[PDB]
Amino acid sequence: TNQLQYLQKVVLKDLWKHSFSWPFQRPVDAVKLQLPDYYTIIKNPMDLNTIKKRLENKYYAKASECIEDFNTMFSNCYLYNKPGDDIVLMAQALEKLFMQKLSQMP
Amino acid sequence: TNQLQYLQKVVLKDLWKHSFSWPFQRPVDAVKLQLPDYYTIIKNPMDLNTIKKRLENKYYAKASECIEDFNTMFSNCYLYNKPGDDIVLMAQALEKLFMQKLSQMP
Numbered sequence: 001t002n003q004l005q006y007l008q009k010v011v012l013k014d015l016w017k018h019s020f021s022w023p024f025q026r027p028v029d030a031v032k033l034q035l036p037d038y039y040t041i042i043k044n045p046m047d048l049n050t051i052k053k054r055l056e057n058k059y060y061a062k063a064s065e066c067i068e069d070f071n072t073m074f075s076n077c078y079l080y081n082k083p084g085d086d087i088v089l090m091a092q093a094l095e096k097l098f099m100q101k102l103s104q105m106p
Numbered sequence: 107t108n109q110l111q112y113l114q115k116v117v118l119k120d121l122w123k124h125s126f127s128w129p130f131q132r133p134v135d136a137v138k139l140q141l142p143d144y145y146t147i148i149k150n151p152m153d154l155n156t157i158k159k160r161l162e163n164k165y166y167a168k169a170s171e172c173i174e175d176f177n178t179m180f181s182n183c184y185l186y187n188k189p190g191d192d193i194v195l196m197a198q199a200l201e202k203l204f205m206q207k208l209s210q211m212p
């Protein structure tokens with residue numbers, strides 16, 4: 001659980017502190033945010049909080065499973081949205097930061 | 107050139123060999139493939155061949171710059187398309203294979 005501890009103590013915490021992660025800290029509320037077909041279009045929803053619980057509850061067996069989840073969160077946003085959307089710009093900054101943290105992993 | 111040697115000799119070559127990389131081995135030809143607004147929508151196009159040239163011509167100073175190009179090629183497909191599209195399924199398999207290779211970089 002060494003790389004997993006990195007993902008939890010370093011990667012996640014660092015991403016969490018940035019305000020551009022705020023829309024990603026909870027599953028998408030399709031009603032409150034008026035995204036009526038969100039769950040019709042996205043089949044594998046993912047958010048940071050789900051990722052955090054999975055780390056807390058020892059859900060992951062290997063670090064690749066966690067990294068898949070992050071990847072799914074970003075691509076989900078790209079799929080659902082289009083270039084130029086605010087949320088996409090936010091997703092892009094999170095992802096960049098993510099990849100930078102990952103390159104430092106043991 | 108160490109990590110950049112891995113990206114060229116291991117990562118690029120392994121991805122190139124899969125038929126699902128065929129659509130990404132040349133810049134999108136918007137006319138022949140009848141994607142009229144591709145270049146209107148996508149502001150930063152990227153493909154394997156461009157990445158390959160950049161490695162050959164010693165364009166990247168650093169591993170992060172080349173990894174950034176791969177990420178752009180993936181997100182570009184996601185942004186331009188939508189869930190369930192063939193090209194998207196392809197991008198996803200490419201990206202997954204990409205991530206596994208990355209995890210084995212020095």
Ligand SMILES: CCc1cnn2c(NCc3ccc[n+](O)c3)cc(N3CCCC[C@H]3CCO)nc12
Pocket residue numbers: 022023024028029033076077080081086087
């Ligand atoms: C911290 C407040 C919050 C909670 N949910 N949420 C959402 N949910 C939609 C969503 C989230 C993640 C990925 N995808 O695809 C859709 C969007 C959003 N914002 C949209 C973009 C510009 C900032 C901003 C506006 C309103 O706070 N802010 C929030």
Ligand SMILES: CCc1cnn2c(NCc3ccc[n+](O)c3)cc(N3CCCC[C@H]3CCO)nc12
Pocket residue numbers: 128129130134135139182183186187192193
């Ligand atoms: C290997 C032949 C080829 C060359 N270009 N191209 C494209 N260009 C569009 C494109 C590429 C990369 C990212 N984005 O966003 C759009 C698509 C495509 N296909 C689409 C999906 C299922 C396979 C297949 C069908 C017809 O060969 N095949 C090809």
Ligand SMILES: [Cl-]
Pocket residue numbers: 078079080081082184185186187188
């Ligand atoms: Cl999209």
